[PDB]
Structure formats: C-alpha cells, structure tokens
Amino acid sequence: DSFVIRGDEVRQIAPGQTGTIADYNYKLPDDFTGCVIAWNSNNLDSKVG
Amino acid sequence: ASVYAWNRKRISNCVADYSVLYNSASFSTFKCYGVSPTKLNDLCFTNVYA
Amino acid sequence: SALGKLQDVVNQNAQALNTLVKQLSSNFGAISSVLNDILSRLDPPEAEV
Structure with missing residues (x-):
C-alpha cells in the first residue's frame, strides 16, 4: 500500500485509530497484520512554491 | 485562560452536534x-463540563 | 422448623441463583457492568477489551 500523507498524520495510520485521511481515503482493518514503513519525501516531492 | 486557572464552563440544556x-x-x-x-x-x- | 432439611435445599438453590444473578451487576474491572452501554459508547477495539 503506497501513498503520500502529511508528517503529523502518520499516527492515524495505525490499527484502531481514526482520522480524516483514514476514513474517506484509506481505511485499515483493526486486526491488520504486517508493517507500516515511512520515510521523508520533502527533498523529492516539494517545491518552493 | 491559563493552565493554573483553567476556565470551567458547565454545559446544560443543550442538543449538541459533535x-x-x-x-x-x-x-x-x-x-x-x-x-x-x-x-x-x-x-x-448530564453533569457536562468544559 | 421440623422440615428444615428440605428448606435448606430450597434456600441453598435460591441463594446460589441469587448470587449468580447479582454477579451480572459486577463490572469486573470494565467501565460498566452493562453490555449495552459499552456497545453504545466505544469503537470495537476498546469495546472488545
């Protein structure tokens, strides 16, 4: 599952958690097994404007 | 208000949409x-606080 | 109190049933002893606990 989200909104990507981005766009099962891995993308997905 | 003097507003007779x-x-x-x-x-x- | 032997059986059975019924009012460390309150107040991850 590959997606781009904000830095403060990574905590909402967890089992048994709720949020604006976690409901309408991508919802995880409560008993989800596996891993969630993230790394910074500011240096490649951001511009001055 | 400040943390040591937090404002305590009792809420009653409401129909709230959270x-x-x-x-x-x-x-x-x-x-x-x-x-x-x-x-x-x-x-x-009842007994609602804020 | 001539018939106390049968009355003892009756009272023991009634007392055991009463204890069993009153155990439904113990929350056993949960937030409430009523299942409907837990079901109507919490999401499944914490309601499960």
Missing part, C-alpha cells in the same frame, strides 16, 4: 478516553 468538532480540521488533536468520538451523537449526558 460533528463540528470531529470533522473539523482546525483541531490538531482529538483524543477520547471513556467514549469514542464517532458515537457521541448517540448518547445523552
């Missing part, structure tokens, strides 16, 4: 302990 808090992006943190945020609209409370 969607204005839950769905609003203006709140940087929504955490509940004894209840769940989505199910607040289905419950009746």
Whole structure:
C-alpha cells in the first residue's frame, strides 16, 4: 500500500485509530497484520512554491 | 485562560452536534478516553463540563 | 422448623441463583457492568477489551 500523507498524520495510520485521511481515503482493518514503513519525501516531492 | 486557572464552563440544556468538532480540521488533536468520538451523537449526558 | 432439611435445599438453590444473578451487576474491572452501554459508547477495539 503506497501513498503520500502529511508528517503529523502518520499516527492515524495505525490499527484502531481514526482520522480524516483514514476514513474517506484509506481505511485499515483493526486486526491488520504486517508493517507500516515511512520515510521523508520533502527533498523529492516539494517545491518552493 | 491559563493552565493554573483553567476556565470551567458547565454545559446544560443543550442538543449538541459533535460533528463540528470531529470533522473539523482546525483541531490538531482529538483524543477520547471513556467514549469514542464517532458515537457521541448517540448518547445523552448530564453533569457536562468544559 | 421440623422440615428444615428440605428448606435448606430450597434456600441453598435460591441463594446460589441469587448470587449468580447479582454477579451480572459486577463490572469486573470494565467501565460498566452493562453490555449495552459499552456497545453504545466505544469503537470495537476498546469495546472488545
């Protein structure tokens, strides 16, 4: 599952958690097994404007 | 108000729609302990505080 | 109190049933001893606990 989200909104990507981005766009099962891995993308997905 | 002198406004005789808090992006943190945020609209409370 | 032997059986059975019924009012460390309150107040991850 590959997606781009904000830095403060990574905590909402967890089992048994709720949020604006976690409901309408991508919802995880409560008993989800596996891993969630993230790394910074500011240096490649951001511009001055 | 300040942390040592927190303002305590008692709430009564209301019919509250908690969607204005839950769905609003203006709140940087929504955490509940004894209840769940989505199910607040289905419950009746007295002795309410803020 | 001539018939106390049968009355003892009756009272023991009634007392055991009463104790069993009153155990439904103990929360056993949960937030409430009523299942409907837990079901109507919490999401499944914490309601499960």
